[PDB]
C-alpha cells in the first residue's frame, strides 16, 4: 500500500506514526505541546506538529533539535538551535561549525523556526534530497538484516522511518552527542 521504501517519502499520517514511535523508543524526543506560540498546520494534530529534543551536548555547547514535516518534499526536515554553556544563544557562524563542511555548504541555511510565531533563529537543513537518502538508507538497513538473518520481512516498517532519518542526521552533525541503536 505505502510506497515509502520505494520513494523514501512519508505522508503526514506516516510522519505522526514515525514520530510516536520515536517518542516511545527514545523518550528524550517529545512531540510539541499545545501552545499559542505555535503556528499550527491544519494537516497535523495540534499536539503532533513537530518533535523536540532539548540540550543535546556538543564538543561546551548544547543543541535543541527540531523535526518538522516538509510538505513540499514529503520528508522530515530538521532545525538546530545552539546554546553556549551559559545558556546564551549561539551564532549562525558558530552553529555552522557543528555541521559537516560539505553538507553544511550545500543544505544549511539560517532561518527562524517556522512553527513559532515568536522569532527563534535556527539552522535549517534543506530537505531537498532527503527522500533519495532515506531510500538508500532504508534498503541498506534491509541488507544488514538480510545478512543477519542468514545464519522477506527484513524491510523496516514506516513508523521506524524517523530513527533511520536521525541516524542519517547524526552523521551530518558528528559533534552533537546523540546516537540511535536498535536490534
Numbering used by the authors: 19 to 77, 166 to 257, 277 to 308
Give verbatim lines from the article.
Many facets of autophagy rely on the autophagy-specific ubiquitin-like protein (UBL) Atg8 in yeast (or six LC3- and GABARAP-family UBLs in higher eukaryotes, here referred to collectively as Atg8-family members) and the E1–E2–E3 enzymatic cascade that links Atg8′s C-terminus to the primary amino head group of phosphatidylethanolamine (PE) lipid molecules. The central enzyme in the Atg8 lipidation cascade is the E2, Atg313,24. In addition, Atg3 displays unique, functionally important structures: an N-terminal amphipathic membrane-binding helix (N, residues 1–18); an intrinsically disordered flexible region (FR, residues 85–159); a handle region consisting of a helix and a disordered region (HR, residues 237–282) that contains an Atg8-interacting motif that is dispensable for the lipidation reaction but plays important roles in vivo; and a flexible extreme C-terminal extension (C, residues 299–310).
To illuminate roles of Atg3E123IR-binding to the Atg3cat, we determined a crystal structure lacking these interactions for comparison to the prior structure of full-length Atg3. The structure of a version of Atg3 lacking the N-terminal 18 residues and the FR region (Atg3∆NFR), determined at 2.5 Å resolution, superimposes well overall with that of full-length Atg3 (0.48 root-mean-square deviation over C-alphas). In the structure of full-length Atg3, the catalytic Cys234 is sequestered in a pocket formed by side chains from the HR and two loops. By contrast, in the absence of the Atg3E123IR element, Atg3′s catalytic center is structurally rearranged into an activated conformation through a domino-like effect that ultimately results in remodeling a loop observed in full-length Atg3 into an additional helical turn at the N-terminus of the HR; the remodeled helix cannot restrain the side-chain from catalytic Cys234, thereby allowing the alternative orientation where Cys234 is surrounded by additional key catalytic residues (left). Moreover, it appears that the extreme C-terminal region of Atg3 also rearranges between the E123IR-bound and other states: this element undergoes a conformational change and additional C-terminal residues are visible in the crystal structure of Atg3∆NFR relative to the prior structure of full-length Atg3. In the conformation in Atg3∆NFR these residues would clash with the bound E123IR, although their nearby location also suggests potential to positively interact with the E123IR in an alternative, presently unknown conformation.
